[PDB]
Amino acid sequence: KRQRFVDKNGRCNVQHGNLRAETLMFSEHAVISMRDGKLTLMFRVGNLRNSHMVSAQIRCKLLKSRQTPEGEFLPLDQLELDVGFSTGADQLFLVSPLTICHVIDAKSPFYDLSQRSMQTEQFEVVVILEGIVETTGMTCQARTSYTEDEVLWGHRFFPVISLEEGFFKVDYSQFHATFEVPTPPYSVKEQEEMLLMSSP
Amino acid sequence: KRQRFVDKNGRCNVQHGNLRAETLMFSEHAVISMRDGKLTLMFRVGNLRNSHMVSAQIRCKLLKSRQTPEGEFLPLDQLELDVGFSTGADQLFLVSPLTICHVIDAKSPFYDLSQRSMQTEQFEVVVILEGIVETTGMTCQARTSYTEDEVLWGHRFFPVISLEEGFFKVDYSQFHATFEVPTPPYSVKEQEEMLLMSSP
Amino acid sequence: KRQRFVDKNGRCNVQHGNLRAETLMFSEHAVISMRDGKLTLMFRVGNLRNSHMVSAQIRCKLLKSRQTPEGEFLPLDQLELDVGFSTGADQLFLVSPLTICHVIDAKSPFYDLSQRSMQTEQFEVVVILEGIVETTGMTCQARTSYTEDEVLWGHRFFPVISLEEGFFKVDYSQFHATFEVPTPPYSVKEQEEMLLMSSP
Amino acid sequence: KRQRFVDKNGRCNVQHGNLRAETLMFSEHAVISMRDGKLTLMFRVGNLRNSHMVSAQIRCKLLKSRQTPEGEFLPLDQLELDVGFSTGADQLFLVSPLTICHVIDAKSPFYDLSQRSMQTEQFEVVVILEGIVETTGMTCQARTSYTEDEVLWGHRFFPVISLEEGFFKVDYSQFHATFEVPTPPYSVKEQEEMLLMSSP
């Protein structure tokens, strides 16, 4: 009886309301905060075509100038940010907006990014979203970028989907909106360090 | 001498008989039951184009409202259901119907889904099947959905393929049909718990 | 000075001589024999378009009727045969013929296939080769099949490529040809068993 | 305030200056040298279309004649060179030139390639770069090759990107340029051997 998101035949019961306007779109900011027990870098992606995006896939690169231990200066090195290639979660079912998650762990290049170290670091998260417009079979690409000052430590995205009368409504007025939530200041590596300290 | 499924040249010796009618199709229900020693979520997919589906690939998302440990309400979170991305089994050779299998294990979001817990949970399995119609090079997508009341604990699919005179016949009258088979009521996690109990 | 296979600009110095004739092609048989220390199932694939095959990828399914431990009869179950999806070796650079290799190990469904057990088993290896004809952007698929009597235990493929005067020549008269080589009769599982026996 | 590589809308602020000329291009040579603590095989790839390359992906094969332990002569065997398929780093964001890296480790076929052993070995690195020209949806492939004498032990690529006034400039006069840097002569396997020697 309760309303389903997708009908047996494939039709999605989503409505798009309160309308990067009218294509694929990305939240203005990214955030870092606690989810399911882990420090997570998050941003939001949306689809306002009314074609389905077939084989939708997202990837993320961290762009940064750095110096290698050997002393070489790399003016704009690209490091991978895992956003699903490890589970298949990077192959998106994107009809309503999703919060893409990068879990910060020992393999993440943000492993030792703390709230304080962020005020000093310079980096750029580059997001790449590719898919096939079912309408024409054409492959398209959209991108965005987050600089260090567009990543908000201790913020959480508001929800944009609600249940109302036989469809799931998406409130695009809340697409970019975040709020502050209590969040440790430490990097995951520091958090890790401070446990292999205070452990019996 | 015995009849082969595929001839040396590539031609499949399948016949489609007793005919989601005339496209790609999905069983009406999914089931959960024991196969090869493991509790498995199963559903059936078919192909009634007479184009071959080139690069056919299936994925599955569990859609559910939940609350994170941090107390955030996620109105429609998407979790991955592994249906092969770990072995390449998600790249289907789909001429006759297949029973797609999700092995329920510690990584599955259904790890603690028991027959009793199912009467209370609300979830939606979303299935996405993509391929290229060889005929035109166009990429298509078909989908379906299983709600908690369309997943049948302790059911098994009937077989739809038989051998008859120089071809393998597919009986589409049995495509959706299941039957009850004796199956433990417990979740895999409970099954696991009850062994690290009663073990010398 | 010595002749290279591929020039700096991308042009391949292969010549095709002594000519599944004039498309993609597959050896008539597969073999099983020792390579680099492991029992390997091998077959040969060729490309006689004169388009390059872009994003060429091969997969292999074992088709077999079997009975599950729970006593269910599966009339035509599909098991994966790893032919590279673990290293990226399944994304082929296919200008001259290649010997595709399935290493028989504990994960292979042929793990306990011995020369004697082969005289009794019924199975069908199905091979699927997909790529994009660069010429038109169209995605094509070719297939073949090996039954149990078309898999030759203790055979080895002859080489089809030689060096001659500024190009690498492919001798298509030897494409299907194999010869017998001395090869243990035992399955890999038996080989494994017989070492955890005779071990100090 | 500081200039970003990619604008919020996706537009890249790269300029291409001092101009394999006018397509996709590859450095003339590859090098092997120390980066981030590891012996790395490196080469450079560029994109001078002014279409974006959508779903850009690179792979690398080592082509070599060798003899298997069983005594078979393989006139032109293909071994995989990992250039990212393990992290997703093989799916390139290629607007300015990148230095593609193959980390030499125990799985690399170059695991025991030393500077001295290189003067004797014969091999060919084959590079394959595929993508979709966004302009037309057509899939293209470019290739190059490095023979043993085109791989420079103890060389490092110069940087080709600099910051200048509201855009990142690419100096194509330095695209092929390398210089010598101090680098151990030993293979990684020898380096490894010489540590499990001189270890308390």
The amino acid occupying position B12 is C
C/D interface, count of CB pairs below 8 Å: 73
For D95-120, what is the HEC assignment?
Answer: CCCEEEEEECCCCCCCCCCCHHHHCC
Residue showing tokens 């798009």: A16
The residues pairing with B44 across neighbouring beta strands, listed in sequence order, are: B99
Chain A nearest C-alpha distance from D174 (Å):
14
Residue closest to B134 by CA, chosen among B59, B58, B55:
B55
User: What is the C-alpha to C-alpha distance for residues C75 and B158, in angstroms, rounded to an integer?
Assistant: 11
The amino acid occupying position B180 is E
- Chain A residues with CB under 8 Å of D140 CB are none
* Cβ neighbours of residue D107 closer than 8 Å, sequence gap 6 or more: D82
- Alpha helices per DSSP H over chain B: 115-118, 188-193
Chain D nearest C-alpha distance from A143 (Å):
4
- Chain B residues with CB under 8 Å of A34 CB are 70
Tokens of B154: 């302790």
The separation between the first and the last C-alpha atoms of chain C, rounded to the nearest angstrom, is: 52
Number of Cβ atoms within 10 Å of the Cβ of A141? 18
The amino acid occupying position A1 is K
The separation between the first and the last C-alpha atoms of chain A, rounded to the nearest angstrom, is: 52
Torsion sign, CA atoms A182, A188, A152, B74: negative
Decide the pairing of beta strands A38-47 and A24-26. Answer: antiparallel
Instruction: At C29, give phi and psi (nearest 5°).
Output: -125, 160
User: What is the C-alpha radius of gyration for chain D, rounded to an integer number of angstroms?
Assistant: 19
- CB-based contact C21:C82 (threshold 8 Å): no
User: What is the C-alpha to C-alpha distance for residues C149 and C122, in angstroms, rounded to an integer?
Assistant: 9
Question: What is the DSSP code string of A125-168?
Answer: EEEEEEEEETTTTEEEEEEEEEEGGGEEETEEEPP-EEEETTEE
Q: Which residues of D74-104 are buried (b: 16+ CB within 10 A; e: fewer)?
A: bebbbbbbbbbbeebbbbbbbbbbbbbbbbb
3 state SS of D89? coil
Question: What is the DSSP code string of C73-105?
Answer: EEEEEEEE--SSTTTTTTB---SS-EEEEEE--
The answer to whether A8 contacts B85, with C-beta atoms less than 8 Å apart, is no
User: What is the C-alpha to C-alpha distance for residues C2 and C167, in angstroms, rounded to an integer?
Assistant: 10
- CB-based contact A44:A99 (threshold 8 Å): yes
User: What is the C-alpha to C-alpha distance for residues D161 and D175, in angstroms, rounded to an integer?
Assistant: 10
* Cβ neighbours of residue A138 closer than 8 Å, sequence gap 6 or more: A132, D137
* Cβ neighbours of residue B184 closer than 8 Å, sequence gap 6 or more: B34, B39, B191
Torsion sign, CA atoms C23, C26, C27, C28: negative
Residue closest to A77 by CA, chosen among C188, D89, C40, D88:
D89
Residue showing tokens 């704009």: A76
Nearest CB neighbour to C128, from listed B36, B93, B156: B93
3 state SS of A108? coil
3 state SS of D191? helix
Q: In what order do the strands lie in the sheet with A161-164?
A: A14-17, A167-171, A161-164
The residues pairing with B138 across neighbouring beta strands, listed in sequence order, are: B133
- Chain B residues with CB under 8 Å of A44 CB are none
- CB-based contact C26:C19 (threshold 8 Å): no
Q: Does the beta carbon of C87 lie under 8 angstroms from any beta carbon of chain D?
A: yes
Q: ∠D59-D60-D61 over CA atoms, to 5°?
A: 130
User: What is the C-alpha to C-alpha distance for residues C8 and D28, in angstroms, rounded to an integer?
Assistant: 8
- CB-based contact A140:D54 (threshold 8 Å): yes
Q: Does the beta carbon of C182 lie under 8 angstroms from any beta carbon of chain D?
A: no
**What's the CATH code of the domain at D167?**
2.60.40.1400
> CA distances (Å), C183 to each of C36, C176, D75, D80, in order?
13, 20, 22, 27
DSSP assignment letter at D157: E
Q: Where are the beta strands (DSSP E) in chain C?
A: 14-17, 24-26, 30-35, 38-47, 53-67, 73-80, 98-103, 124-133, 138-147, 151-153, 155-157, 161-164, 167-171, 178-180
C-alpha count within 13 angstroms, C-beta hemisphere, residue A113: 26
Tokens of D24: 């996709």
- CB-based contact A22:A48 (threshold 8 Å): yes
In total, chain C counts a number of residues equal to: 200
H or E, element range at C191:
helix C188-193
Nearest CB neighbour to C124, from listed B5, B96, B159: B5
- CB-based contact B104:B118 (threshold 8 Å): no
Domain that holds residue B175: 1-200
- CB-based contact B123:B102 (threshold 8 Å): no
C-alpha count within 13 angstroms, C-beta hemisphere, residue A79: 15
Tokens of D32: 């092997």
Torsion sign, CA atoms B20, B24, B29, B34: positive
Chain centre distance of CA D167: 25
- CB-based contact B67:B74 (threshold 8 Å): yes
- CB-based contact D117:D189 (threshold 8 Å): no
> CA distances (Å), B96 to each of B87, B92, B138, in order?
21, 11, 21
- Resolution of the solved structure (Å): 2.1
Residue showing tokens 């480790």: D105
- Chain A residues with CB under 8 Å of D134 CB are 139-141
Tokens of C175: 């494409």
Exposed, middle or buried by CB within 10 Å (0-12, 13-18, 19+), for B50? Answer: exposed
3 state SS of C150? helix
Number of Cβ atoms within 10 Å of the Cβ of A162? 13
Contacts of A71-78 spanning 24+ positions with Cβ under 8 A? A72/D35, A72/D156, A73/D159, A74/D159, A75/D159, A75/D161, A75/D162, A75/D163, A76/D5, A76/D96, A76/D161, A76/D168, A78/D93, A78/D98
The amino acid occupying position D132 is I
* Cβ neighbours of residue A148 closer than 8 Å, sequence gap 6 or more: A118, A121, A122, A123, A124
Q: Where are the beta strands (DSSP E) in D19-82?
A: 24-26, 30-35, 38-47, 53-67, 73-80
The residues pairing with C66 across neighbouring beta strands, listed in sequence order, are: C74
C-alpha count within 13 angstroms, C-beta hemisphere, residue A71: 2
Decide the pairing of beta strands C167-171 and A151-153. Answer: unpaired
Q: What's the total number of domains in chain A?
A: 1
Chain B nearest C-alpha distance from C48 (Å):
15
Residue showing tokens 């890296």: D101
Nearest CB neighbour to B69, from listed A37, A93, A163: A37
User: What is the C-alpha to C-alpha distance for residues B155 and B179, in angstroms, rounded to an integer?
Assistant: 5
- Which experiment gave this structure? X-ray
Residue closest to A97 by CA, chosen among A165, A164, A32, A15:
A15
Instruction: At C150, give phi and psi (nearest 5°).
Output: -110, 10
Residue ranges of B 130-169 with Cβ closer than 8 A to chain A: 130, 137-145, 147
